[PDB]
Amino acid sequence: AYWNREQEKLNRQYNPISHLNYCEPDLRVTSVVTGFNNLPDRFKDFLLYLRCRNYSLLIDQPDKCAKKPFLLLAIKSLTPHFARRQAIRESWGQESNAGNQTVVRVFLLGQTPPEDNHPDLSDMLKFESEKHQDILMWNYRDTFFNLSLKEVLFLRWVSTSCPDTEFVFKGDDDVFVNTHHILNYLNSLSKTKAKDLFIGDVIHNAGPHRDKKLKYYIPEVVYSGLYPPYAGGGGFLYSGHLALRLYHITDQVHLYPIDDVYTGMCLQKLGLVPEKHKGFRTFDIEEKNKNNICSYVDLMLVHSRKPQEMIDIWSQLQSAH
Amino acid sequence: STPPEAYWNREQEKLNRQYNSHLNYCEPDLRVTSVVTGFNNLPDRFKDFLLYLRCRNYSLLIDQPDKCAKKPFLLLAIKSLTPHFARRQAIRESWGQESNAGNQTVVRVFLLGQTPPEDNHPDLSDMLKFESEKHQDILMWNYRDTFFNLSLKEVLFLRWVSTSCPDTEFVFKGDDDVFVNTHHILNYLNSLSKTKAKDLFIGDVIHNAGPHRDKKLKYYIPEVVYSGLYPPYAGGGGFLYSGHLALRLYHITDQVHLYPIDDVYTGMCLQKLGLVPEKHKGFRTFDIEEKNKNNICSYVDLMLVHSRKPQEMIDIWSQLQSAHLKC
Ligand SMILES: *[C@@H]1O[C@H](CO)[C@@H](O[C@@H]2O[C@H](CO)[C@@H](O[C@@H]3O[C@H](CO)[C@@H](O)[C@H](O)[C@@H]3O)[C@H](O)[C@H]2NC(C)=O)[C@H](O)[C@H]1NC(C)=O
Ligand SMILES: *[C@@H]1O[C@H](CO)[C@@H](O[C@@H]2O[C@H](CO)[C@@H](O[C@@H]3O[C@H](CO)[C@@H](O)[C@H](O)[C@@H]3O)[C@H](O)[C@H]2NC(C)=O)[C@H](O)[C@H]1NC(C)=O
Ligand SMILES: O=c1ccn([C@@H]2O[C@H](COP(=O)(O)OP(=O)(O)O)[C@@H](O)[C@H]2O)c(=O)[nH]1
Ligand SMILES: O=c1ccn([C@@H]2O[C@H](COP(=O)(O)OP(=O)(O)O)[C@@H](O)[C@H]2O)c(=O)[nH]1
Ligand SMILES: *[C@@H]1O[C@H](CO)[C@@H](O)[C@H](O)[C@H]1NC(C)=O
Ligand SMILES: *[C@@H]1O[C@H](CO)[C@@H](O)[C@H](O)[C@H]1NC(C)=O
Ligand SMILES: [Mg+2]
Ligand SMILES: [Mg+2]
């Protein structure tokens, strides 16, 4: 498989044409990937531009972490998702300073360019960024298969602009997160379990989906074998110290079309295994418990909820029993 | 003794006898708790619909008073909710663009109410005000924007046509999740006789419909609320009518009680005018066949298709501009 063979080459370089800033189309893939011409467009773009990751930040918040945070909330989003971001601001993503444990929030965006037929929402996004001061936007095409790029550029921003946050929560903009429970959990940790914390909805021994109709389909010609253990499904929680170690190792791992698999590949290279926490309810909760606020007291996150549902749950949680 | 009709029917019978306050009484009408059988067991949307039925004098908070300074040929009026920024912007850029080919002016408004914090809506109100200042195409009224208040959205829009755009030749009223082939609409309007034009009303018209009685369905209506059948009505995403008829509809709205389903209410008003809306097969409110969805020639001969995402509307519109070369 192509990714496996290219990654083996990387392994030989680090453990005896750039893979990091070559940003012309890599036309060699049209010769060496069998059946390249019949691959879906997302795979063609992924393969042609694999070796380019030096994209610039167009909208930054460089002093976001001027007061060293206890918890950084970093939420993946797309330009048009205004209601999702605003509901997060008002509910579980509120910034705070309780107990002098500061919580800060950023949203992680790429471009939604006109060539992909996106409406031009640059005026609204600028208004939102000036009002709320929490948008980070980079100059790459925001797509599902560039989410591992979103991951690497975010880790690069943690390294440059938020290196001292004690913990990081990285998650999606359609999950409900019980941030109080997350904070209670983090404050229970020993110094030892904290320095390399990485928890979430972790699966072992998964492999690529081979059914061409599935969202996470990966052809055999792109990747072979099984996936490393990885946390997926909507969000995960880890230490800022480990964030720096993860950023440093990203140069040694080729980007991958599925972001959460990529993060698992970086952890494996560090010799770490992410740990499952049952409070990450990435397949929702039982239908019978969905209208009982007590079901939300004992979890970390649940996928998926609409903007109004996030605000409704958060408001009810504040008076739970 | 013949069985009593449902609550809506009995109030409409009263209205009919008065014409042959129900308009600005805005306290809760507590009489409904006594006369609507099983009121206490109704879903909340019905309780609110019934308690505030007699109130329709809500203020315009964001207006575009000069929208029709030049008498339009076609007014595009698109129902939307505050958070739908991407839908509105895709419509502006594609099929809802304002234009003036052949001096037949096309102008656009989006029709909004409030999305208040009490309904757990995120606060996007400052953004909306900025959007209105940038694009000058938002009409916003001070009422709670909900599915069961869409007939209120209809009446307040028709009131605005009467006060602020009474001379538009035609009106298209539609949803913000449809693709509209506005070029085909303009050619259709330019094909009409003077007489067919004065009372044009076309869309995806259903005859012989009645209220859905299954409590799990979106358009469920209890038997204690409405009894009997629906008049013919155009539904499904948009419909097209003359500005002259728009004024006749506005006048008759005082004579028809509001109704939880906006397109049925419009059908009720047309019936009271003695008109029957006409089906046009180009209103593809259940979409087109899967095998045709990626052939731009399928969009050339339709009026509208439900439903399309913002990126899909822009893609279709872009390809449509050169479809004459392939179709
Ligand atoms: C991930 O994001 C990157 C950066 O935005 C995307 O790279 C860009 O991809 C487009 C093609 O989709 C490239 O445009 C094409 O360039 C060729 C060669 O000059 C030109 O002939 C085509 O007409 C078209 O303009 C663009 O150069 C490239 N930009 C870079 C590398 O900076 C990439 O597509 C995204 N990947 C995925 C999986 O979405
Ligand atoms: C359609 O829009 C109207 C106008 O916004 C909505 O009327 C408003 O409905 C709410 C209840 O949902 C009323 O608030 C309630 O008032 C009572 C006392 O008056 C109070 O005890 C409740 O706690 C709550 O505050 C509000 O007064 C009423 N406003 C007006 C101007 O009539 C109506 O609910 C919407 N209808 C539907 C079907 O959504
Ligand atoms: O091009 C993209 C597609 C998705 N997302 C974000 O990625 C997350 C997961 O998207 P989705 O819910 O569609 O994935 P799923 O839960 O189906 O795996 C959400 O925060 C989306 O806003 C993104 O940032 N860029
Ligand atoms: O409270 C509401 C709910 C919906 N809509 C608009 O009503 C139209 C139809 O909504 P929907 O697509 O959900 O209805 P359906 O196609 O299922 O009948 C769309 O323009 C929505 O933006 C609205 O203006 N206010
Ligand atoms: C990355 O670096 C290369 C070489 O310095 C440069 O040519 C390219 O433009 C950069 N890519 C981007 C997207 O900035
Ligand atoms: C409608 O008019 C009545 C009486 O003039 C007034 O009491 C009421 O507040 C008005 N309704 C609204 C929503 O402004
Ligand atoms: Mg999701
Ligand atoms: Mg619809």
Numbering used by the authors:
A (entry chain A): 57 to 72, 90 to 394
B (entry chain B): 52 to 71, 91 to 397
Can you quote the paper on this entry?
The majority of mammalian poly-LacNAc is synthesized by the alternating iterative action of β1,3-N-acetylglucosaminyltransferase 2 (B3GNT2) and β1,4-galactosyltransferases. B3GNT2 is in the largest mammalian glycosyltransferase family, GT31, but little is known about the structure, substrate recognition, or catalysis by family members. Here we report the structures of human B3GNT2 in complex with UDP:Mg2+ and in complex with both UDP:Mg2+ and a glycan acceptor, lacto-N-neotetraose. The B3GNT2 structure conserves the GT-A fold and the DxD motif that coordinates a Mg2+ ion for binding the UDP-GlcNAc sugar donor.
The crystal structure of SeMet-B3GNT2 in complex with the donor analog UDP and Mg2+ (SeMet-B3GNT2:UDP:Mg2+) was solved at 1.55 Å resolution using single-wavelength anomalous diffraction. Two molecules were found in the asymmetric unit of the SeMet-B3GNT2:UDP:Mg2+ structure that were arranged as a dimer with a ∼924 Å2 interface formed between helices α4, α5 and α12 from each chain. The SeMet-B3GNT2:UDP:Mg2+ structure reveals a GT-A Rossmann-like fold comprised of eight twisted β-strands and 12 α-helical segments. The donor nucleotide sugar binds in a pocket located at the carboxy end of the GT-A fold β1 and β4 strands (secondary structure elements refer to the core GT-A fold nomenclature in Fig. S1 and Fig. 3B). There is unambiguous electron density for the Mg2+ and UDP bound in the pocket. Asp215 and Lys223 form hydrogen bonds with the uracil N3 and O2 atoms, respectively. The other side of the nucleotide sugar binding pocket is formed by Loopβ5-β6, which contains the DxD motif (Asp245-Asp246-Asp247). The last residue in the DxD motif, Asp247, acts as a ligand for coordinating the Mg2+ cation. His356 and two water molecules also interact with the metal. In the acceptor-free B3GNT2:UDP:Mg2+ and SeMet-B3GNT2:UDP:Mg2+ complexes, the Asp333 and Gly-Loop305:307 are only observed in the inactive conformation despite the fact that the latter structure was solved in a crystal form that is isomorphous to the B3GNT2:UDP:Mg2+:LNnT complex.
